[PDB]
Amino acid sequence: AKSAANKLDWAKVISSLRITGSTATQLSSFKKRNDEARRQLLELQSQPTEVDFSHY
Amino acid sequence: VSTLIPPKVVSSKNIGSAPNAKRIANVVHFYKSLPQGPAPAIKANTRLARYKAKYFDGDNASGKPLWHFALGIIAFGYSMEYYFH
Numbered sequence: 177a178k179s180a181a182n183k184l185d186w187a188k189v190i191s192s193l194r195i196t197g198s199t200a201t202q203l204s205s206f207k208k209r210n211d212e213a214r215r216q217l218l219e220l221q222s223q224p225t226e227v228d229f230s231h232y
Numbered sequence: 233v234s235t236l237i238p239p240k241v242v243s244s245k246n247i248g249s250a251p252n253a254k255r256i257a258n259v260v261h262f263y264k265s266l267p268q269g270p271a272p273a274i275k276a277n278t279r280l281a282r283y284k285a286k287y288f289d290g291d292n293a294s295g296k297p298l299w300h301f302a303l304g305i306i307a308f309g310y311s312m313e314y315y316f317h
Contacts, residue, residue, distance in 0.1 A: 192239075200236035 178212070 185205055192198055246252055276285065287297045 195238055204235045
């Protein structure tokens with residue numbers, strides 16, 4: 177559902193062409209992409225966080 | 233550190249820039265301008281004004297009334313000849 181948010185983000189990039197020199201709004205998009213990429217690799221990296229009592 | 237915000241700071245920006253001064257000049261320049269040649273006062277008479285309106289506008293603009301004025305001096309000084317010599 178975040179794809180609509182990022183569609184709105186690129187709409188705001190092509191409208192932020194009207195304001196060149198955004199100091200930290202593009203950095204805010206940078207930070208949200210950074211920790212979004214961090215959390216998606218964190219949840220894909222995550223196992224069922226347990227020790228297998230049956231086998232292991 | 234957070235979502236920074238210059239998309240909407242237009243409300244107090246619109247004084248200092250150069251098209252603002254031109255804009256506040258020419259919105260004042262446009263309203264009192266008469267639309268389509270109105271109130272030109274094309275008819276006027278003050279016992280000498282039809283002479284001006286027929287002769288001394290930019291349409292005709294010919295110096296021949298000065299000729300008539302020269303003729304007036306030919307009416308004047310030659311008659312002063314009749315008064316002097």
